[PDB]
């Protein structure tokens, strides 16, 4: 029993974190095989950051202008190239701790674990979701740039996020591991703002199913709803439209609990209209939307507390 914001064990990623320094600018890199991946922002100084031309800044660099440190060992850079907003630094040593890995670009509403890192040293791990507006509500300070987000499946680390910047609202923006930003953001210190965000409806429903699995049914009701009638209510509360694909993805959780997906939607509609009445669900007074249906199946018992 119980239900926590649960991150993946971070050890396979900790073994890949290095420090990349160009001049006085330092950040984190990801050392996989003989390549170190880091944000291209490492080649800027404070006077370059409002509108850097990275192609022009990079051609002025040599391999020996990049200092890469893994713990206390220094890694020699023998080649470099820019791909989108990441640098790929070829080093003379393959990382012996390289896990089985993939690079994945996730959809909004998906979750991942973040290994917050400073000066190449992991400091903490927490769970995040990619918001519908393609920001994440992380916890990052200066020096965190290059920290990575990931999921793990059968000892394969799927890297999906590399951290770059903080927006004026205190939320965070970054790239996939090929250097493509999530959302419309660019890696320069300009007026940028996260677009209006919405609540991840399919995740809220998955979390309601988790509450039922763990033994709580107070929020259910005897009603049902059509998918269209639900979305007209969801839209007025700034919830994402629920699609038939979302309904199918909630299939396994609906089967385990005996609660039809559209019946849980009727429960959610009532929670949105009535509030919680000073009650909690899985220890939260708000509707939680950063657990995917996969996250619930991974953590919850396969046996419902009936």
């Amino acid at each position: 029993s119980g239900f926590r914001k649960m991150a993946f064990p971070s050890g396979k990623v900790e073994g890949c974190m290095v420090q990349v320094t160009c001049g006085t600018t330092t950040l984190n890199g990801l050392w996989l095989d003989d390549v170190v991946y880091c944000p291209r922002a490492v080649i800027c100084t404070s006077e370059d950051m409002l509108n850097p031309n990275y192609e022009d800044l990079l051609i002025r660099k040599s391999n020996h202008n990049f200092l890469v440190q893994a713990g206390n060992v220094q890694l020699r850079v023998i080649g470099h190239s820019m791909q989108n907003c990441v640098l790929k630094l070829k080093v003379d040593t393959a990382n012996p701790k390289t896990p089985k890995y993939k690079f994945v670009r996730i959809q909004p509403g998906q979750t991942f674990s973040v290994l917050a890192c400073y000066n190449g040293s992991p400091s903490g791990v927490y769970q995040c979701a990619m918001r519908p507006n393609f920001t994440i509500k992380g916890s990052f300070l200066n020096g965190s740039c290059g920290s990575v987000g990931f999921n793990i499946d059968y000892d394969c680390v799927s890297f999906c996020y590399m951290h770059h910047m903080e927006l004026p609202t205190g939320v965070h923006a970054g790239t996939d591991l090929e250097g493509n930003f999530y959302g419309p953001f660019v890696d320069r210190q300009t007026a940028q703002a996260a677009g209006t965000d919405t609540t991840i409806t399919v995740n809220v429903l998955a979390w309601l199913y988790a509450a039922v699995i763990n033994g709580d049914r107070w929020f259910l009701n005897r009603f049902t709803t059509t998918l269209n009638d639900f979305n007209l209510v969801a839209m007025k509360y700034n919830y994402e439209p629920l699609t038939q694909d979302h309904v199918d993805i909630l299939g396994p959780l609906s089967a385990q609990t005996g609660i039809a997906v559209l019946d849980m939607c009727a429960s959610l509609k009532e929670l949105l209209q009535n509030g919680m009445n000073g009650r909690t669900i899985l220890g939260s007074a708000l509707l939680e939307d950063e657990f995917t249906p996969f996250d619930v199946v991974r953590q919850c018992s396969g046996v419902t507390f009936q």
Binding site: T24, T26, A41, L50, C145, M165, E166, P168, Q189, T190
Partner: peptide
């Protein structure tokens, strides 16, 4: 305000 590239100083 402006976005902030959260690099570190060394």
């Amino acid at each position: 305000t402006s976005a902030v590239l959260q690099s570190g100083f060394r």
